[PDB]
Amino acid sequence: SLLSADEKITESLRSTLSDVLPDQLQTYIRTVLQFSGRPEGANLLTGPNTEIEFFSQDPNKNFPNIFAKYSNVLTVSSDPNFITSEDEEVKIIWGRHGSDSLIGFDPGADLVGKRRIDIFLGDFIDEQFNPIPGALNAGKSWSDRFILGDWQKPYYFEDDETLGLNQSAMILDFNPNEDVIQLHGDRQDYELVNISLGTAIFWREKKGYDLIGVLGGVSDLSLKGDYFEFKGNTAPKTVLKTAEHIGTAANDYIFSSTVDAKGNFYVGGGTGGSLGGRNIGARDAWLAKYDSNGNQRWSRQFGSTGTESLWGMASDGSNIYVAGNTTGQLENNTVKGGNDAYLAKYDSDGNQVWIKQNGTYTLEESYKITVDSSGNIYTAGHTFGSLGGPNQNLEQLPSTDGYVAKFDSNGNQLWVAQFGTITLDDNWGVAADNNGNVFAGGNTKGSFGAKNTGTAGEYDAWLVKLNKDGQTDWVRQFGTPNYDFMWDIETDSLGDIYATGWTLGDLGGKNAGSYDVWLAKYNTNGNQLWIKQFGTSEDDAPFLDGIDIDANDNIFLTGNTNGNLGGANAGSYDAWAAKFDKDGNQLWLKQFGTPDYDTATTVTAVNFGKLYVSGITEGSLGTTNAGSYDSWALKLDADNGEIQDFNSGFLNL
Ligand SMILES: [Ca+2]
Ligand SMILES: [Ca+2]
Ligand SMILES: [Ca+2]
Ligand SMILES: [Ca+2]
Ligand SMILES: [Ca+2]
Ligand SMILES: [Ca+2]
Ligand SMILES: [Ca+2]
Ligand SMILES: [Ca+2]
Ligand SMILES: [Ca+2]
Ligand SMILES: [Ca+2]
Ligand SMILES: [Ca+2]
Ligand SMILES: [Ca+2]
Ligand SMILES: [Cl-]
Ligand SMILES: [Mg+2]
Ligand SMILES: [Mg+2]
Ligand SMILES: [Mg+2]
C-alpha cells in the first residue's frame, strides 16, 4: 500500500545514507546540495558536521580517498559510466558536463538482500560550484540518460512484500525538459507518487509495489512524458553478426587491445561477471587472446575482492603487459592506500607472470601503458599524492599531478617522474619513441606548458617529452578558451608525437557543433606541426584508447558520435573509426553500431594486416545482449574500413 509512502521513503533513505556515508562526505555533500538549486537530499544526511581532511596522510581519513570510495565522478565528455562497480552500498554517480549515459546498478550482480542507493547527478558541472562570471559554460546543461532499468529487468527491484525501499536510485538534478529516465517494461508497469522529496517511481508488481527511484525536486510528472524511455521486455535484435561478441549477464567492457608479433589479437577490460574466470568480487580485470583467424585461444581474469580494470595493454612482441587501477590488494602485493595503480605481465600462453601494485596513501588512477623496442615498459597516470616527487599542491585544495613510471621486463621500477601544476593535471596518454624517450599527454586546468586562455580553468591539452632517465625535455600545451580534452597519444616511426581528443571550441578549425574530434602532431623538438579538427553538428569524440599508428605511419582514430559522421546514425551514440596519413590527410571515415548506445574504446592496427576496432554496447552487436553492457571486436580492412567476418588456388609450376 502506498499509504504513508512519503514517510517510509524518507526514513529508509535517510537511515541508509546516514549509516553508510562517512560524516566527512556527508558534510561535503550537504554543502554541495545547499549551494545548488536542488537541496532536497541534504536532510537525508544526518551525520554531524565534520572537518573535511583534504590532506590527511591517513588513508582512512584522506578525503580524496573517502570521496572516491563512494563516488563515480565522470569526465567533461559525454560519458558512459565506464567506472561502475558493485563494491559499495551507496554511490554518488556524477556525470558533470556532456550528455552522460548514467548507470550504477549491475543487473547481473548478486545483490539479493543488499542495500543499494545510487545517487545520480546528471550535470552539476564545475562552473556551478566554482562560479566565475562570464565562464563559457556557466548555466549550460546536457541531456543525461538515467538508466533505472532496461529490456531485461527493472533495476533496484527487490520483488518482495515490502515497498522495496532497500534498493533505489535517487536522481537529484533531473530536468524533464532535457534529461531522460530509462525504464524496463512499459508505462502501465509504473505508478508515480508525489512526495515531499519530489517524485517516487514505483514498479507495479500487480500485487504490490517496489520503489525504483526518487526524483528530487520534481513533481507532477506524467509517465506519458517523452522524458521517460521504456525498453520493453525483449533483448534488442542482433546486428553486425560479423563482430566477435563478448558478454555475460553483468556489465562487461573492453577498454584496450593489442597485437603480438605473430598477429594474435588481444582485448581486455573490466567485468562484473565471470568472463575469463570466476568473479572474485565486484569488477575484475580480464583479457583474452585470438589467433589471426578469429579463434579465441584463451581468456583470463584477475584482481581482488575490490574493484579493478585493465585500462591499457601492450606487447613486447610475445608477452602482454597490462595496466590499470585497483581498490583492493592484488596477489603477492601490498596496498599503499586508497586506490592504487598496477602493472601486470602475461605470457603468450595466458600465464600471469607477475603483478606490481604501487601508489601512495591517496588516490592513483592509471589508464595508459606503452612498451619500447628494448622491451621496457612505461605506465602513466595521475596521483593526488607524492609518487615521483612532491605533489605540486601540498598541505598549506588537493588535485592531481601526472606521472610516468618506467619498468624493466621483470617489473623492477627504474624511475618514476611526476609533473604538473598546482591544479588538476590528468594523464591520458603515454608513448615511447625509438631513441629512448617517452611522451606523456593529458588534460590540465592550469598553465603547464603555456598560458591557459580559458577564463575559468577550462581544460587544455598538454604533452611532455621525457628522456631515458625520466627528466623532462619540454612541456607543451595547446587548446581553446573552452574545454579541450585529450584521450590518447602515439608516436610514428620518425619519433613525432600525435594526440587525439575532443574540443568544444575552434582548435584546428571552426567547430561544426557540440563536441568535435581533433588530431594534433608535434615533432620531437616540441614544434606544433598541425592540428586537424572534424565532426558533425552533433557530438563527436574519440574515447579511451583512441589512437594507434602502424608501421607505415598510418594513424587510426576511434570513438563515438551521435551524429551522421561516417554514415547514417543507427540510434543513440554509434562507434566510428578513421584513418589518416602522417601529414594529417584523412583517408577514410566509417561508422557502425546498433540502434542503442555504442562506443568504440580501442583501436589496434596489425602491421600489413587487419585493423581491429573494439568497444562496448547496450545493444545486441554480434549476438543477443546477455545483460546491460556487452563488448565487441570488429575486424576491418585497414585500406577502406570495411567490416570483415571476424572468423576466417595454388599452382605447381
Ligand atoms: Ca560527463
Ligand atoms: Ca552531464
Ligand atoms: Ca542534464
Ligand atoms: Ca526497490
Ligand atoms: Ca574484483
Ligand atoms: Ca593509493
Ligand atoms: Ca597538479
Ligand atoms: Ca582549453
Ligand atoms: Ca560536432
Ligand atoms: Ca593507443
Ligand atoms: Ca548506436
Ligand atoms: Ca553484459
Ligand atoms: Cl575529467
Ligand atoms: Mg513489493
Ligand atoms: Mg564464437
Ligand atoms: Mg601500436
XYZ file of C-alpha atoms and ligand atoms in Angstrom:
669
model
C 0.000 0.000 0.000
C 1.233 3.468 -0.970
C -0.183 4.798 2.311
C 2.463 6.868 4.136
C 4.888 6.237 1.261
C 6.376 9.709 1.836
C 7.375 8.997 5.441
C 8.587 5.449 4.775
C 10.743 6.554 1.833
C 12.336 9.452 3.712
C 13.089 7.340 6.796
C 14.552 4.471 4.769
C 16.749 6.655 2.541
C 17.903 8.775 5.474
C 18.689 5.670 7.526
C 20.758 4.025 4.789
C 22.564 7.127 3.531
C 23.427 8.342 7.026
C 24.604 4.863 8.037
C 26.860 4.285 5.006
C 28.360 7.628 4.023
C 31.188 8.824 6.304
C 30.447 12.055 8.157
C 33.193 13.893 6.247
C 31.483 13.083 2.963
C 28.034 13.887 4.349
C 29.323 17.323 5.352
C 30.818 17.908 1.896
C 27.731 16.700 0.029
C 25.333 18.746 2.177
C 27.362 21.822 1.252
C 27.217 20.912 -2.445
C 23.453 20.387 -2.360
C 22.840 23.587 -0.402
C 24.991 25.588 -2.830
C 22.968 24.283 -5.799
C 19.304 24.707 -6.728
C 18.482 21.183 -5.514
C 18.715 20.947 -1.696
C 16.219 18.090 -1.294
C 18.750 15.382 -0.441
C 20.524 17.279 2.340
C 18.035 16.340 5.061
C 18.730 12.654 4.328
C 22.312 13.074 5.640
C 22.125 13.425 9.429
C 25.730 12.822 10.484
C 27.351 15.607 12.500
C 29.248 18.365 10.733
C 32.795 17.081 10.460
C 36.081 18.672 9.439
C 36.988 17.592 5.895
C 40.520 16.186 5.944
C 41.551 17.191 2.437
C 45.252 16.495 3.050
C 45.411 13.762 5.714
C 48.091 11.152 5.084
C 45.975 8.551 6.895
C 44.375 6.568 4.030
C 41.239 6.139 6.137
C 40.772 9.889 6.731
C 42.187 11.258 3.463
C 39.232 12.924 1.853
C 40.085 12.197 -1.817
C 40.120 8.511 -0.776
C 36.782 8.852 1.024
C 35.129 10.723 -1.841
C 36.467 8.254 -4.428
C 35.318 5.252 -2.382
C 31.662 6.320 -2.561
C 31.537 8.026 -5.957
C 31.802 7.623 -9.714
C 32.840 11.131 -10.791
C 32.971 11.076 -14.582
C 34.538 13.421 -17.146
C 33.751 16.587 -19.084
C 32.962 14.255 -22.012
C 29.633 12.653 -22.836
C 30.343 9.563 -20.695
C 29.008 6.098 -20.278
C 29.702 5.209 -16.661
C 32.885 3.381 -17.518
C 33.892 3.061 -13.837
C 30.751 1.476 -12.346
C 31.359 -1.442 -9.986
C 29.288 -3.191 -7.319
C 31.706 -2.528 -4.459
C 29.626 -0.295 -2.131
C 26.065 0.024 -0.870
C 25.857 3.752 -1.712
C 27.392 5.504 -4.726
C 27.303 9.106 -5.915
C 27.336 8.956 -9.729
C 28.250 12.364 -11.119
C 28.154 12.964 -14.865
C 29.434 16.574 -14.988
C 29.485 18.117 -18.474
C 28.349 16.210 -21.543
C 25.359 14.041 -22.420
C 26.041 11.222 -19.980
C 24.648 7.682 -20.061
C 24.460 7.070 -16.327
C 24.147 3.607 -14.780
C 25.061 2.378 -11.325
C 23.212 -0.900 -10.759
C 24.534 -4.087 -12.360
C 21.541 -6.359 -13.190
C 23.900 -9.339 -13.344
C 25.382 -8.937 -9.869
C 24.205 -10.893 -6.843
C 22.629 -8.039 -4.869
C 19.856 -10.003 -3.136
C 19.300 -8.554 0.322
C 21.884 -5.795 -0.191
C 21.152 -2.149 0.499
C 21.747 -0.222 -2.738
C 21.215 3.513 -3.218
C 22.733 5.192 -6.265
C 22.622 8.986 -6.088
C 22.681 10.429 -9.608
C 23.826 13.899 -10.663
C 23.409 14.232 -14.418
C 25.314 17.510 -14.714
C 26.057 19.615 -11.601
C 29.005 20.993 -13.537
C 32.152 22.561 -12.089
C 31.048 26.053 -13.185
C 28.061 25.888 -10.828
C 30.205 25.360 -7.723
C 33.228 27.381 -8.892
C 31.189 30.403 -10.005
C 33.164 32.753 -12.249
C 31.181 35.500 -14.041
C 31.116 35.006 -17.790
C 32.549 31.468 -17.709
C 31.845 29.978 -21.131
C 29.848 27.047 -19.752
C 28.101 28.815 -16.873
C 24.435 27.801 -16.931
C 24.986 25.079 -19.536
C 23.416 21.650 -19.187
C 23.100 18.483 -21.248
C 20.640 15.681 -21.892
C 21.613 12.925 -19.481
C 20.100 9.450 -19.555
C 19.473 7.924 -16.116
C 19.309 4.151 -16.519
C 16.854 2.714 -13.975
C 16.095 -0.427 -15.993
C 16.427 -1.938 -19.415
C 14.949 -4.584 -21.724
C 15.860 -7.290 -19.198
C 14.579 -6.105 -15.807
C 13.839 -3.040 -13.702
C 16.798 -2.024 -11.575
C 16.743 -1.657 -7.753
C 13.900 -4.201 -7.746
C 13.631 -6.383 -4.652
C 10.320 -8.040 -5.661
C 9.201 -8.841 -2.129
C 6.289 -7.991 0.151
C 7.846 -4.692 1.275
C 7.687 -1.377 -0.562
C 11.163 -2.190 -1.892
C 12.893 0.749 -0.186
C 16.173 -1.086 0.401
C 17.276 -0.502 -3.204
C 16.504 2.685 -5.080
C 18.010 5.299 -7.318
C 17.927 8.925 -6.202
C 18.274 11.428 -9.060
C 18.883 14.907 -7.712
C 19.017 17.137 -10.831
C 16.518 15.566 -13.235
C 15.387 18.179 -15.767
C 12.300 16.883 -17.615
C 12.935 19.370 -20.442
C 16.266 17.721 -21.308
C 17.072 14.519 -19.414
C 15.682 11.005 -19.891
C 14.797 8.324 -17.337
C 15.121 4.867 -18.874
C 12.802 2.162 -17.520
C 12.103 -1.520 -18.046
C 8.778 -2.591 -19.496
C 6.039 -0.070 -20.322
C 4.211 2.806 -18.669
C 1.469 0.503 -17.347
C 4.137 -1.130 -15.154
C 4.618 2.047 -13.092
C 2.905 4.474 -10.754
C 4.266 7.924 -9.912
C 3.668 9.374 -6.444
C 4.239 12.960 -5.357
C 6.242 13.001 -2.119
C 7.955 15.677 -0.051
C 11.300 14.951 -1.738
C 9.754 15.176 -5.211
C 8.556 12.128 -7.176
C 8.690 8.434 -6.308
C 8.748 5.944 -9.202
C 7.139 2.643 -8.145
C 7.099 -0.579 -10.139
C 3.687 -2.294 -10.093
C 4.054 -5.964 -9.191
C 0.274 -6.322 -9.797
C 0.098 -7.462 -6.179
C 2.425 -4.876 -4.646
C 4.869 -2.040 -5.296
C 8.641 -1.623 -5.389
C 10.495 1.689 -5.287
C 12.731 2.058 -8.348
C 13.813 5.682 -7.971
C 13.171 9.036 -6.333
C 13.434 12.276 -8.324
C 14.449 15.111 -6.013
C 12.762 18.461 -6.520
C 10.447 17.496 -9.411
C 6.710 16.840 -9.097
C 3.559 16.326 -11.172
C 5.259 14.353 -13.932
C 3.475 12.049 -16.376
C 4.523 8.536 -17.380
C 3.406 9.664 -20.853
C 6.118 12.334 -20.989
C 8.816 11.876 -23.594
C 11.384 12.233 -20.795
C 10.592 8.591 -19.938
C 12.009 5.950 -22.294
C 10.537 2.467 -21.877
C 12.551 -0.515 -23.030
C 10.062 -3.358 -23.095
C 10.942 -6.896 -22.053
C 12.823 -8.300 -25.061
C 16.506 -8.098 -25.914
C 17.487 -5.925 -28.900
C 17.554 -7.640 -32.264
C 21.092 -8.572 -33.263
C 23.084 -6.597 -35.807
C 26.675 -6.948 -37.051
C 26.890 -10.724 -36.760
C 30.364 -10.276 -38.281
C 31.581 -8.957 -34.908
C 33.079 -11.002 -32.097
C 30.692 -10.709 -29.146
C 31.984 -10.896 -25.556
C 29.488 -10.734 -22.746
C 27.964 -12.017 -19.517
C 24.807 -11.127 -17.630
C 26.832 -8.435 -15.821
C 28.489 -5.263 -17.138
C 31.348 -6.236 -19.471
C 33.804 -3.762 -21.007
C 36.646 -3.912 -23.484
C 38.871 -0.936 -22.704
C 42.063 -1.776 -24.613
C 43.638 -4.080 -27.188
C 47.000 -5.017 -28.680
C 48.650 -7.401 -31.123
C 51.761 -9.520 -30.856
C 54.485 -10.207 -33.397
C 52.680 -13.284 -34.761
C 49.463 -11.365 -35.428
C 47.492 -12.660 -32.461
C 44.903 -10.133 -31.308
C 44.241 -9.324 -27.640
C 41.449 -7.435 -25.886
C 40.803 -6.730 -22.251
C 38.990 -4.576 -19.762
C 36.724 -4.951 -16.745
C 33.756 -7.170 -15.941
C 31.212 -7.503 -13.175
C 30.674 -11.104 -14.236
C 32.600 -14.347 -14.682
C 34.092 -13.718 -18.107
C 37.634 -15.128 -18.119
C 37.199 -16.929 -14.800
C 35.036 -16.953 -11.711
C 34.321 -13.410 -10.489
C 36.469 -12.548 -7.461
C 34.306 -9.653 -6.281
C 32.764 -6.538 -7.821
C 34.566 -5.620 -11.050
C 37.549 -7.737 -12.116
C 40.170 -7.232 -14.813
C 40.158 -9.598 -17.779
C 41.911 -10.208 -21.086
C 41.669 -12.623 -23.989
C 43.756 -13.837 -26.932
C 42.592 -14.567 -30.503
C 44.567 -16.018 -33.366
C 44.619 -14.107 -36.647
C 41.749 -16.252 -37.985
C 39.468 -15.112 -35.139
C 39.559 -18.209 -32.927
C 39.778 -17.452 -29.214
C 42.868 -19.081 -27.717
C 42.247 -18.221 -24.059
C 40.682 -15.775 -21.637
C 41.917 -14.824 -18.188
C 40.503 -12.897 -15.259
C 42.278 -11.488 -12.243
C 42.053 -8.983 -9.438
C 40.775 -8.797 -5.886
C 37.552 -8.705 -3.896
C 37.586 -4.957 -4.593
C 37.383 -3.210 -7.961
C 39.938 -3.279 -10.760
C 40.084 -2.942 -14.531
C 42.532 -3.449 -17.319
C 42.711 0.053 -18.834
C 45.741 -0.428 -21.080
C 47.641 -3.263 -22.686
C 50.693 -3.549 -24.932
C 53.025 -6.262 -26.158
C 56.792 -6.656 -26.401
C 56.099 -8.979 -29.348
C 55.443 -12.039 -27.174
C 54.390 -11.078 -23.646
C 51.331 -8.938 -22.904
C 51.733 -6.133 -20.369
C 48.573 -4.773 -18.797
C 47.919 -1.744 -16.615
C 45.115 -0.249 -14.607
C 43.902 0.583 -11.105
C 42.613 -1.340 -8.109
C 40.712 -0.529 -4.933
C 41.941 -3.757 -3.340
C 45.114 -5.742 -2.702
C 46.323 -7.746 -5.687
C 48.019 -11.141 -5.359
C 51.555 -11.077 -3.887
C 51.245 -7.335 -3.269
C 50.577 -4.819 -0.506
C 48.190 -1.869 -0.666
C 49.628 1.650 -0.417
C 46.350 3.379 0.481
C 43.069 4.089 -1.204
C 43.121 3.193 -4.876
C 46.459 2.183 -6.383
C 47.863 1.592 -9.853
C 49.179 -1.733 -11.082
C 51.200 -3.234 -13.906
C 50.993 -6.923 -14.745
C 52.689 -9.275 -17.203
C 51.048 -12.177 -19.048
C 52.918 -14.586 -21.273
C 51.630 -15.683 -24.683
C 50.061 -18.800 -23.138
C 47.985 -16.822 -20.660
C 50.123 -17.391 -17.574
C 50.222 -14.459 -15.176
C 53.951 -13.823 -14.743
C 53.825 -11.057 -12.107
C 51.840 -8.078 -10.805
C 53.312 -4.871 -9.377
C 50.938 -2.678 -7.366
C 52.157 0.764 -6.435
C 50.979 4.191 -5.474
C 50.636 6.458 -2.467
C 48.455 6.750 0.626
C 45.889 8.597 -1.530
C 44.186 8.259 -4.925
C 46.011 6.976 -8.019
C 44.484 6.392 -11.426
C 46.296 4.795 -14.350
C 44.803 4.356 -17.806
C 47.832 4.018 -20.093
C 50.779 1.773 -20.932
C 53.432 1.569 -23.664
C 56.318 -0.819 -24.408
C 59.504 0.303 -26.130
C 61.594 -1.604 -28.670
C 64.019 -2.649 -25.925
C 61.149 -4.330 -24.095
C 60.964 -1.830 -21.247
C 57.517 -0.800 -20.069
C 56.069 2.590 -19.155
C 52.844 3.236 -17.319
C 51.231 6.594 -16.855
C 48.506 8.023 -14.691
C 47.702 10.694 -12.152
C 48.001 10.945 -8.391
C 46.791 13.100 -5.521
C 49.984 12.164 -3.665
C 53.765 12.397 -3.976
C 54.631 9.400 -6.133
C 57.507 10.516 -8.347
C 58.177 13.638 -6.306
C 56.325 16.153 -4.127
C 52.841 16.915 -5.403
C 52.622 20.454 -6.736
C 49.835 21.058 -4.197
C 50.873 20.055 -0.665
C 49.191 20.802 2.653
C 49.065 24.553 3.290
C 42.575 22.148 -2.462
C 44.046 18.772 -3.396
C 44.495 17.954 -7.060
C 46.190 15.522 -9.397
C 49.646 15.590 -10.923
C 50.600 13.422 -13.876
C 53.168 10.662 -13.616
C 55.106 8.251 -15.798
C 56.761 5.119 -14.396
C 59.398 3.050 -16.212
C 59.877 -0.672 -15.550
C 62.120 -3.430 -16.832
C 60.787 -6.767 -18.089
C 60.909 -8.261 -14.584
C 58.771 -5.455 -13.188
C 61.566 -3.589 -11.412
C 60.804 0.116 -11.283
C 63.596 2.048 -12.967
C 62.225 5.527 -12.188
C 59.016 7.495 -11.653
C 58.536 11.046 -12.915
C 55.822 13.370 -11.609
C 54.922 16.776 -13.008
C 52.186 19.332 -13.468
C 50.663 22.484 -11.971
C 49.103 23.490 -8.656
C 45.709 22.433 -10.058
C 44.313 19.409 -11.954
C 46.675 17.577 -14.311
C 45.303 14.236 -15.549
C 47.171 11.771 -17.779
C 45.542 10.432 -20.942
C 48.476 9.112 -22.909
C 51.936 7.556 -22.947
C 54.139 6.564 -25.879
C 57.784 5.637 -26.373
C 59.861 6.588 -29.386
C 62.734 4.553 -30.848
C 65.505 6.615 -29.228
C 64.938 6.089 -25.516
C 62.457 8.906 -24.910
C 58.872 8.676 -23.731
C 55.985 11.091 -24.256
C 53.042 11.657 -21.944
C 49.901 13.689 -22.535
C 46.728 14.712 -20.810
C 44.469 17.497 -19.548
C 45.159 20.426 -17.263
C 43.084 23.185 -15.683
C 46.285 25.194 -15.224
C 49.136 26.775 -17.164
C 51.537 23.847 -17.517
C 53.211 24.325 -20.891
C 51.524 27.584 -21.880
C 49.235 30.285 -20.567
C 45.757 28.800 -20.340
C 43.476 31.160 -22.290
C 40.346 29.904 -20.553
C 38.906 32.435 -18.136
C 37.551 29.805 -15.723
C 40.095 26.992 -15.635
C 38.712 25.119 -18.628
C 40.867 22.193 -19.694
C 43.754 22.420 -22.126
C 45.743 19.544 -23.634
C 49.368 19.048 -22.585
C 52.312 16.974 -23.833
C 55.596 16.182 -22.044
C 58.751 14.649 -23.509
C 60.900 12.683 -21.037
C 64.376 11.322 -21.696
C 65.660 7.827 -20.885
C 66.236 8.864 -17.257
C 62.808 10.389 -16.680
C 63.940 14.019 -16.914
C 61.725 16.440 -18.828
C 62.991 17.820 -22.129
C 59.962 20.003 -22.762
C 56.331 20.648 -21.872
C 53.769 21.843 -24.412
C 50.186 22.965 -24.036
C 47.511 23.732 -26.599
C 43.817 24.453 -26.601
C 40.957 26.901 -26.964
C 39.373 29.075 -24.251
C 36.791 26.271 -23.915
C 37.311 22.680 -22.776
C 39.746 20.624 -24.852
C 40.203 17.013 -23.770
C 42.919 14.532 -24.768
C 42.219 10.780 -24.780
C 45.358 9.105 -26.197
C 48.750 9.650 -27.856
C 51.116 7.653 -30.060
C 54.433 8.061 -31.879
C 55.319 7.357 -35.501
C 58.471 5.795 -36.933
C 60.275 9.160 -37.011
C 59.576 9.797 -33.326
C 56.983 12.509 -33.840
C 54.111 12.527 -31.346
C 50.386 12.545 -32.164
C 47.491 13.182 -29.798
C 43.745 12.865 -30.242
C 40.847 14.254 -28.269
C 37.725 16.383 -28.442
C 37.093 20.090 -28.233
C 34.100 22.325 -27.620
C 35.890 25.208 -29.346
C 37.757 26.093 -32.550
C 41.027 24.236 -32.084
C 42.000 23.066 -35.575
C 39.205 24.897 -37.378
C 35.649 26.122 -36.947
C 33.660 23.901 -34.578
C 30.852 22.181 -36.504
C 28.739 21.956 -33.343
C 28.887 20.402 -29.864
C 31.973 18.205 -29.367
C 34.351 17.834 -32.334
C 37.325 15.484 -32.846
C 40.886 16.752 -33.134
C 44.239 15.226 -34.089
C 47.450 17.103 -33.271
C 51.036 16.416 -34.312
C 54.219 17.685 -32.643
C 57.791 16.969 -33.675
C 60.437 15.609 -31.323
C 61.688 19.144 -30.640
C 58.309 20.392 -29.437
C 57.193 22.224 -32.578
C 53.456 22.016 -33.277
C 53.195 20.786 -36.868
C 49.410 20.812 -37.357
C 46.011 20.251 -35.756
C 43.127 18.731 -37.725
C 39.565 19.135 -36.422
C 36.499 17.402 -37.843
C 32.994 16.405 -36.915
C 29.264 16.853 -37.377
C 26.826 19.358 -35.902
C 26.280 16.738 -33.172
C 28.545 15.209 -30.522
C 31.700 13.586 -31.970
C 34.705 12.434 -29.949
C 37.446 9.822 -29.653
C 37.253 7.745 -26.499
C 39.737 5.981 -24.189
C 42.310 4.080 -26.340
C 41.568 6.351 -29.247
C 44.715 6.321 -31.437
C 47.076 3.746 -32.912
C 49.823 4.064 -35.555
C 51.011 1.243 -37.810
C 54.432 0.547 -39.360
C 53.511 2.585 -42.435
C 52.864 5.583 -40.143
C 49.151 5.499 -40.839
C 47.127 6.920 -37.953
C 43.879 5.318 -36.811
C 41.357 7.043 -34.520
C 38.212 5.723 -32.891
C 35.423 6.803 -30.569
C 31.706 7.637 -30.573
C 29.281 10.045 -32.220
C 25.572 10.780 -32.012
C 25.629 12.369 -35.459
C 25.928 11.137 -39.032
C 29.697 11.210 -39.008
C 30.665 8.200 -41.130
C 27.134 7.367 -42.272
C 23.540 7.472 -41.123
C 23.355 7.208 -37.339
C 21.810 3.890 -36.243
C 20.470 5.300 -32.965
C 21.871 6.935 -29.801
C 25.677 7.017 -29.990
C 27.487 4.871 -32.565
C 31.114 3.854 -32.902
C 33.298 5.438 -35.554
C 36.819 4.915 -36.852
C 39.052 6.889 -39.201
C 42.412 6.574 -40.933
C 44.901 9.402 -41.537
C 48.287 9.635 -43.159
C 51.235 11.104 -41.268
C 50.580 14.556 -42.750
C 47.039 14.630 -41.458
C 45.170 13.776 -44.660
C 42.018 11.833 -43.821
C 41.958 8.611 -45.842
C 38.607 7.201 -44.701
C 35.928 7.624 -42.052
C 33.459 4.899 -41.071
C 30.599 4.490 -38.590
C 28.934 1.373 -37.184
C 26.791 0.241 -34.299
C 23.321 -0.682 -33.083
C 20.123 1.342 -32.508
C 21.201 1.513 -28.851
C 24.207 3.149 -27.174
C 27.572 2.069 -28.621
C 31.077 3.457 -28.350
C 34.427 2.265 -29.561
C 37.039 2.131 -26.814
C 40.176 0.889 -28.578
C 41.825 0.532 -31.980
C 44.843 -1.626 -32.905
C 46.347 -1.978 -36.386
C 48.294 -5.062 -37.412
C 51.322 -4.125 -39.483
C 50.387 -5.015 -43.068
C 47.307 -6.806 -41.681
C 43.808 -6.192 -40.370
C 42.562 -3.249 -38.311
C 40.691 -4.054 -35.110
C 38.157 -1.664 -33.578
C 36.610 -2.798 -30.295
C 34.178 -1.316 -27.826
C 31.058 -1.595 -25.728
C 27.319 -1.552 -26.307
C 23.878 -1.628 -24.719
C 22.572 -3.237 -27.918
C 22.968 -6.672 -29.496
C 26.173 -6.390 -31.517
C 27.465 -9.735 -32.732
C 24.855 -11.723 -30.796
C 21.984 -11.172 -28.366
C 22.889 -8.903 -25.454
C 23.353 -11.013 -22.296
C 22.883 -8.204 -19.806
C 23.455 -4.444 -19.565
C 26.818 -3.646 -21.232
C 28.374 -6.230 -23.545
C 31.515 -5.802 -25.633
C 32.523 -6.400 -29.240
C 35.503 -6.518 -31.587
C 35.307 -5.735 -35.311
C 37.894 -6.839 -37.862
C 38.248 -4.190 -40.580
C 40.093 -3.884 -43.865
C 42.649 -1.202 -42.985
C 42.633 0.172 -46.543
C 38.966 1.186 -46.570
C 37.452 0.464 -43.155
C 35.072 -2.199 -44.452
C 33.983 -4.770 -41.886
C 35.153 -8.355 -42.454
C 33.830 -11.527 -40.861
C 35.731 -11.891 -37.595
C 36.202 -15.636 -38.141
C 38.113 -16.766 -41.243
C 44.109 -21.991 -55.722
C 47.829 -22.819 -55.603
C 49.640 -23.686 -58.845
C 52.549 -26.116 -59.144
C 54.564 -24.566 -61.965
Ca 30.426 13.772 -18.454
Ca 26.037 15.523 -17.903
Ca 21.238 17.097 -17.630
Ca 13.481 -1.011 -4.759
Ca 37.352 -7.539 -8.276
Ca 46.920 4.829 -3.457
Ca 48.615 19.255 -10.258
Ca 41.039 24.991 -23.277
Ca 30.497 18.011 -33.515
Ca 46.574 3.640 -28.432
Ca 24.079 3.272 -31.682
Ca 26.929 -7.948 -20.194
Cl 37.646 14.855 -16.437
Mg 6.981 -5.183 -3.051
Mg 32.106 -17.851 -31.305
Mg 50.595 0.466 -31.861
